[PDB]
Ligand binder design. Structure first.
Ligand SMILES: [Co+2]
Lengths: 132, 10
């Protein structure tokens, strides 16, 4: 189907200062941070938008920290609590009254194995849309 | 679209 207008080209989640003291036990995680992706002006014939997610994983499957803090994974979840690791998709129905589509997502840092170390956190998740 | 994630572990 024809494409909508992508109205969120770039978004940034700043997790702030996390503490290794509280990222010691396996499975410890930061609070969730909200991020939304907006599509507008969906053309006639387009009833669904599918987002596809990419970026480098680490051994845990979650997105690799490209910064210096060790044992830090980055996790993206959808509105159903599903993890959107690299290669995942999420499909939303267009609201015909506004010809728009909204993707409410959340992000957190996670330590799968525990024992996070001090350092930076940096990652980028890319999103590419198909239309049907 | 791109989602950039930043932070520090202290
Ligand atoms: Co925060």
């Amino acid at each position: 189907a024809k494409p909508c207008t992508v109205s969120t080209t770039n978004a940034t989640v700043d997790l702030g200062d996390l503490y290794s003291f509280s990222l010691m036990s396996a499975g410890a995680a930061s609070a969730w941070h909200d991020v939304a992706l907006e599509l507008t002006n969906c053309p006639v014939g387009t009833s669904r938008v599918t987002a596809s997610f990419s970026g480098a994983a680490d051994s845990t499957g979650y997105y690799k920290n490209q910064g210096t803090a060790q044992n830090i994974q980055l996790e993206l979840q959808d509105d159903s609590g599903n993890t959107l690791n690299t290669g995942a998709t999420k499909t939303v129905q267009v609201d015909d009254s506004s010809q728009s589509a909204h993707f409410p997502l959340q992000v957190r840092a996670l330590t799968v194995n525990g024992g996070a170390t001090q350092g930076t956190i940096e990652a980028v998740i890319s999103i590419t849309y198909t239309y049907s | 679209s791109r989602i950039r994630i930043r932070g520090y572990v202290r």
